[PDB]
Amino acid sequence: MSQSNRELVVDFLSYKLSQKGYSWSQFSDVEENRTEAPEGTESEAVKQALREAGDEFELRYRRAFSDLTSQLHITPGTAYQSFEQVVNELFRDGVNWGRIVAFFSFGGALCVESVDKEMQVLVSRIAAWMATYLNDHLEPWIQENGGWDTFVELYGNNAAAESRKGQERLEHHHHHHLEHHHHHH
């Protein structure tokens, strides 16, 4: 619904440590001690779309990424002021669907940039302030563009897309809907 933005951050930072050989949960606190969002309420599709779009961002900046830690000065919590520099541009110059994946992508990398210097304690801190920045700043904008579901409508996980595309090639049809949108309680 709303705090599901937390997942989108967390799931990515988790994967970020995974490709380094670190654990997110070992250095976490986000959903560790408090429960914000489910394991994939709405996000199951949106985070699935997010990680793909995030990947699209990673490789592109990966050229500079390894060197930039010197520029951001990835250190104690003030690395969020380093990531501030960038999230600052990131918001002013065009907050779109795929644009937001950049925020959670470099944020997930910001995580590892900390773990890099063996400061994996930032890992949970960043994820907190990332999802929060989404909560306060991004979420309104997101809603103006449809929402997280809409993101997967546009740039959703094409792996699952191709997965269902196989049988959809034969056209399954015979699927009617009496349901109207996602209902809440």
Partner: peptide, 16 residues
């Protein structure tokens, strides 16, 4: 330097 400018810029490439 960069980063703010760099991700600002490289970020507009999340489509093409």
């Amino acid at each position: 330097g960069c980063v703010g400018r760099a991700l600002a810029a490289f970020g507009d490439c999340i489509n093409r």
